[PDB]
Amino acid sequence: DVYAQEKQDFVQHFSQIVRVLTEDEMGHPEIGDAIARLKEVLEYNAIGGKYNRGLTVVVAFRELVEPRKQDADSLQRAWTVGWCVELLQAFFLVADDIMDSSLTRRGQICWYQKPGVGLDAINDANLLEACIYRLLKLYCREQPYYLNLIELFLQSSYQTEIGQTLDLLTAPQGNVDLVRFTEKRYKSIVKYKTAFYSFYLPIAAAMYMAGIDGEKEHANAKKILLEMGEFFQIQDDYLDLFGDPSVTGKIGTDIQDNKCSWLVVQCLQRATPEQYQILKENYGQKEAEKVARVKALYEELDLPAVFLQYEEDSYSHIMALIEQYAAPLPPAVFLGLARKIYK
Amino acid sequence: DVYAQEKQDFVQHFSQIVRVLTEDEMGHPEIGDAIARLKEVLEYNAIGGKYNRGLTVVVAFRELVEPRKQDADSLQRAWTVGWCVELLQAFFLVADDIMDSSLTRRGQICWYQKPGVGLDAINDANLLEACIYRLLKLYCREQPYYLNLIELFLQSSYQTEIGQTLDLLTAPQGNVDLVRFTEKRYKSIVKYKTAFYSFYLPIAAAMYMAGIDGEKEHANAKKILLEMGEFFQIQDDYLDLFGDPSVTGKIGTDIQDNKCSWLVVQCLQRATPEQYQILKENYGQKEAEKVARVKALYEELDLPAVFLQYEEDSYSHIMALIEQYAAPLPPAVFLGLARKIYK
Ligand SMILES: CC(=O)Nc1cc(-c2cccc3ccccc23)c2nc(/C=C/P(=O)(O)O)ccc2c1
Numbered sequence: 001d002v003y004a005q006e007k008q009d010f011v012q013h014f015s016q017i018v019r020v021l022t023e024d025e026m027g028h029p030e031i032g033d034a035i036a037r038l039k040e041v042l043e044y045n046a047i048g049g050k051y052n053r054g055l056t057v058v059v060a061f062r063e064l065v066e067p068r069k070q071d072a073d074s075l076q077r078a079w080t081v082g083w084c085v086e087l088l089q090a091f092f093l094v095a096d097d098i099m100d101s102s103l104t105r106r107g108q109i110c111w112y113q114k115p116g117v118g119l120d121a122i123n124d125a126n127l128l129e130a131c132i133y134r135l136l137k138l139y140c141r142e143q144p145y146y147l148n149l150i151e152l153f154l155q156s157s158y159q160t161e162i163g164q165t166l167d168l169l170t171a172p173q174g175n176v177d178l179v180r181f182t183e184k185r186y187k188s189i190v191k192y193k194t195a196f197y198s199f200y201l202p203i204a205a206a207m208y209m210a211g212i213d214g215e216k217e218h219a220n221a222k223k224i225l226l227e228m229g230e231f232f233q234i235q236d237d238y239l240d241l242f243g244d245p246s247v248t249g250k251i252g253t254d255i256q257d258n259k260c261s262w263l264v265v266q267c268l269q270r271a272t273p274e275q276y277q278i279l280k281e282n283y284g285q286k287e288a289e290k291v292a293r294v295k296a297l298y299e300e301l302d303l304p305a306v307f308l309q310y311e312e313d314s315y316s317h318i319m320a321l322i323e324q325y326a327a328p329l330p331p332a333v334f335l336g337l338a339r340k341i342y343k
Numbered sequence: 344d345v346y347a348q349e350k351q352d353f354v355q356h357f358s359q360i361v362r363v364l365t366e367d368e369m370g371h372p373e374i375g376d377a378i379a380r381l382k383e384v385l386e387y388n389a390i391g392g393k394y395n396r397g398l399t400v401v402v403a404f405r406e407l408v409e410p411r412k413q414d415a416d417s418l419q420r421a422w423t424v425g426w427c428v429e430l431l432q433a434f435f436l437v438a439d440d441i442m443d444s445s446l447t448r449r450g451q452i453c454w455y456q457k458p459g460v461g462l463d464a465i466n467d468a469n470l471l472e473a474c475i476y477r478l479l480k481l482y483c484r485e486q487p488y489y490l491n492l493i494e495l496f497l498q499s500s501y502q503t504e505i506g507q508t509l510d511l512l513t514a515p516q517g518n519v520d521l522v523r524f525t526e527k528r529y530k531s532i533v534k535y536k537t538a539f540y541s542f543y544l545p546i547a548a549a550m551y552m553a554g555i556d557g558e559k560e561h562a563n564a565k566k567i568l569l570e571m572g573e574f575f576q577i578q579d580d581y582l583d584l585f586g587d588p589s590v591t592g593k594i595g596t597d598i599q600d601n602k603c604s605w606l607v608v609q610c611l612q613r614a615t616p617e618q619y620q621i622l623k624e625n626y627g628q629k630e631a632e633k634v635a636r637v638k639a640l641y642e643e644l645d646l647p648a649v650f651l652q653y654e655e656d657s658y659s660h661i662m663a664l665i666e667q668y669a670a671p672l673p674p675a676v677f678l679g680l681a682r683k684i685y686k
């Protein structure tokens with residue numbers, strides 16, 4: 001498995017990334033302390049996840065470039081670009097965790113929750129973002145796709161932030177309103193908040209690294225990748241509730257947290273005025289009594305079967321997209337990822 | 344006065360900036376709400392200040408470019424780049440206000456303190472940052488200084504964030520330690536936190552817009568501009584305490600807020616072990632009794648005269664820098680600004 005293989009050389013490349021990002025401290029000892037803090041931030045925040053978005057950059061680079069044109073240097077840049085994706089994510093997670101008052105991330109305490117950190121994590125989240133562009137400069141400045149990468153990370157930050165704004169408008173911190181939890185609104189939040197950076201960004205960055213810079217190829221890649229993104233989030237919402245917590249490594253939280261899960265959208269789409277009332281009361285409460293009452297309504301409305309039919313239809317449609325829009329890219333670029341996303 | 348003049352056309356250009364930044368909503372009504380929120384953010388945060396950094400871009404552009412080469416379009420871009428500086432600042436202020444738990448900014452309630460906003464201002468601060476690069480793309484993508492501007496805003500965000508990290512390490516939220524309040528540390532905080540974006544960035548952006556892209560000219564501009572920045576912050580710390588609040592439009596806060604003011608650095612530099620003890624007790628307290636006791640120690644240590652001698656020496660040195668490093672730029676570029684900074 002292309003991913004499992006690559007994981008070692010990718011994670012060992014983090015040591016280099018940090019060394020390089022703490023190198024300006026040598027010529028400027030004045031900022032040494034801030035750099036020392038920068039090291040803590042990266043070491044805590046960029047490490048610990050599965051590195052799936054970062055690894056997509058590498059996997060795609062290897063499938064888009066001739067093994068002859070995959071010299072030591074190209075690879076060093078490929079791992080760096082994957083790391084910039086992880087850095088982009090680490091920045092939205094640090095920030096999101098502050099914004100949603102989260103306690104834990106990847107099982108460990110959120111960076112902002114650490115004693116001594118707090119709201120100083122806001123500046124930390126900005127520093128993780130700064131590193132993206134610092135790395136792009138250090139590794140890619142002489143490459144023709146340099147401006148291309150800069151722009152894509154930028155466009156992706158804005159897409160995500162715009163997505164976050166939409167999500168923050170939909171489910172406010174102290175407001176319960178299932179009215180604005182529509183299918184049309186859900187797909188948008190997922191497109192802007194998740195899909196762009198999670199799916200478009202990693203292949204898109206490898207495409208540019210391979211010299212595939214065409215507006216249309218990118219648009220074809222985007223057509224496919226955004227749809228995969230839509231399925232991924234819908235699956236994440238399903239696995240949050242109905243998913244066995246052993247394999248996933250997560251416990252049900254969407255219901256308590258008033259989140260705009262696909263389940264609630266579907267529940268709202270298919271409900272009698274009386275069925276809507278029960279959810280109105282139970283959804284959003286930190287009481288196992290009410291949390292179990294919501295799962296009982298989803299079950300009654302046969303949503304686990306509305307999802308199974310959706311996963312069946314989605315995989316079908318994604319293959320129909322791959323057939324239609326892969327060319328001239330190798331279908332393996334999208335098939336490798338689809339394999340990971342669907343079961 | 345070059346600034347006072349320019350202010351009108353600059354502030355009227357904000358209407359265009361917002362129109363342009365809310366234009367993607369027309370082709371994507373899905374995100375309309377987020378864009379509507381983006382409008383609130385810009386309208387509140389980017390408007391209300393003196394626009395001094397933004398106006399420096401314009402003033403410098405006008406002094407670096409031949410009036411013949413100052414066509415309608417060049418000007419539209421010049422006002423946009425000035426606006427990107429204001430947008431850069433609006434982003435550090437929104438974030439800083441959250442980080443330091445500030446109540447008011449420019450007399451009005453901090454954006455995060457507004458009912459319904461709160462920590463959602465973190466995402467807002469990120470959106471103001473996104474707009475910089477969105478504008479640069481919309482107005483400057485066909486220009487040879489395009490990558491140059493992108494990079495400078497990026498380098499300046501990181502410089503500022505690195506500065507912020509240093510400042511957050513120096514004076515922690517619940518920790519009183521005057522030991523790390525050194526001259527060497529103060530100059531660094533000021534260089535990274537304030538000087539780079541406030542002084543280098545605006546002239547530097549106009550330089551690139553004028554086709555002055557040389558590493559050495561920029562380094563010469565930087566030599567001068569960073570020194571001006573050092574004087575500006577030292578003056579801001581002085582005016583915070585000893586300055587008449589009518590002309591300034593601010594009331595003394597540094598002492599209560601445990602801030603690494605130049606005054607405290609000087610007080611610490613020139614103090615008997617007994618004089619240090621009095622400050623140790625009084626500095627950082629929300630009690631008019633202790634706040635007045637600190638101002639009495641600064642007064643006794645003749646710091647208002649240590650500042651007057653410093654302002655005398657600084658203006659002298661800044662002129663010696665202008666003589667030495669202005670060429671081939673017109674000295675008026677730096678003299679116009681120095682005029683504004685010194686009395
Ligand atoms: C059927 C199924 O459970 N699929 C599946 C597939 C992936 C996934 C794999 C490869 C590339 C990706 C590229 C983009 C998005 C996802 C992926 C996946 N990723 C994560 C990310 C962890 P982190 O890196 O945040 O710490 C979590 C759960 C996942 C589940």
Ligand SMILES: CC(=O)Nc1cc(-c2cccc3ccccc23)c2nc(/C=C/P(=O)(O)O)ccc2c1
Pocket residue numbers: 391392393394395396399541542575680683684685686
């Ligand atoms: C002797 C003296 O008080 N000088 C003086 C000069 C300026 C200043 C002028 C022009 C360009 C600049 C460019 C960079 C920095 C400062 C300046 C100045 N700016 C501000 C910024 C306000 P805002 O725009 O935050 O809302 C506040 C006080 C100021 C005082």
